[PDB]
Amino acid sequence: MADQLTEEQIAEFKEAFSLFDKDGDGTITTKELGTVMRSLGQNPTEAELQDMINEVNGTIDFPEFLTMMARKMKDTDSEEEIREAFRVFDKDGNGYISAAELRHVMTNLGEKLTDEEVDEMIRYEEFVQMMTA
């Protein structure tokens, strides 16, 4: 699931990975992975380091690094995108002004959807959270 990743994000993370590593391949012991995470600016605890080691004997391959960063940055980007898109519907109102106002935008647009299904699901962010669950 590398599609949730941004081109600039993957470029920056590859740049950091290339700067951290020494001569040779990127496969070094898990202590190197922990130190790279510390240098990247993140605050990974011992449990996060253990999970990253288990995901990847002391070989940090670019695919495994990309996968662990994919899951982490994907959770982070999902949270950030939810927070940003909470204010995406600026035309409906200032903030969650009316249930009918949001329902009109959600039913007149969004996807090929059934008119009665939107009303049934109604009975802003709460609807998105319910749909995600």
Side-chain angles (χ1 to χ4, degrees), residues 58-63 65-71 85 93 95 99-100 110:
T59 81
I60 298 144
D61 210 2
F62 208 86
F65 186 89
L66 189 142
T67 309
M68 71 75 68
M69 184 290 318
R71 54 171 201 61

Side-chain angles (χ1 to χ4, degrees), residues 33 47 68 71:
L33 166 57
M68 71 75 68
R71 54 171 201 61

